[PDB]
């Protein structure tokens with residue numbers, strides 16, 4: 660654990676939190692638990708709340724991993740961001756095998772309702788729909804879109820709101836890092852349209868999985884995302900190939916500069932445990948020691 664907490668410091672700057680992705684496998688090993696307890700104030704389940712883990716077989720839910728994280732979070736006063744309710748990846752074959760509109764709709768609604776109800780009132784925000792956009796801005800042709808149609812998004816959000824009116828509902832996606840990129844402009848326009856039709860989209864989550872030097876563009880991208888009018892926006896899965904302090908500080912400043920940005924979540928704790936470990940993209944090294952990027956963030960927030 661680092662002496663200076665980025666969560667404490669960002670809270671002092673007026674934001675809600677600075678957190679990290681984690682799960683039982685991390686909390687039970689190394690110094691992950693201690694680091695999170697001391698330097699972060701929010702956690703997102705890296706995998707335990709996804710569809711393949713929670714509903715491997717239809718109507719047969721498994722909350723072992725999810726319960727571990729939620730309980731640990733509550734016991735340690737950490738906020739929680741539910742991830743991911745509707746997504747084409749890490750999706751059971753029984754779901755993708757469905758071709759009937761009514762069937763898939765009910766299946767999707769039940770999945771959403773079951774997970775959110777179990778943790779009702781305990782989750783600050785949920786990534787209801789994940790990666791629904793193609794790079795050109797068109798909607799990704801997933802089983803949900805192909806079988807239910809474009810209305811699957813409004814349906815997912817309306818269902819989520821009814822399940823837990825306390826949680827902030829997000830649509831999450833990547834490559835929303837540049838203001839001139841098609842995808843960024845498209846999600847803004849679509850979210851503007853959906854909210855206008857009454858869809859309860861409370862926030863846009865920008866994964867922010869960057870490569871070296873892409874932090875600079877976020878300074879203009881985040882404000883653009885905020886222009887969609889959602890009450891909230893957030894950096895949800897931050898990591899940067901190379902872990903340059905320049906990229907990290909730029910992303911933090913982008914959030915500080917955007918009134919509606921509630922916080923930042925970095926996608927993991929130590930480099931070797933990153934899903935992109937070959938790019939040592941996190942804030943702590945294999946020795947669980949703070950990297951130059953962590954200190955740079957601290958210095959920027961003070």
Ligand SMILES: O[C@@H]1[C@@H](O)[C@H](O[C@@H]2CO[C@H](O)[C@H](O)[C@H]2O)OC[C@H]1O
Nearest residue numbers: 705706742743789833866896926934
């Ligand atoms: O442990 C990794 C996770 O980190 C990874 O997370 C996904 C990555 O793709 C998207 O960003 C999605 O929103 C995240 O949940 O998923 C694979 C798993 O092995």
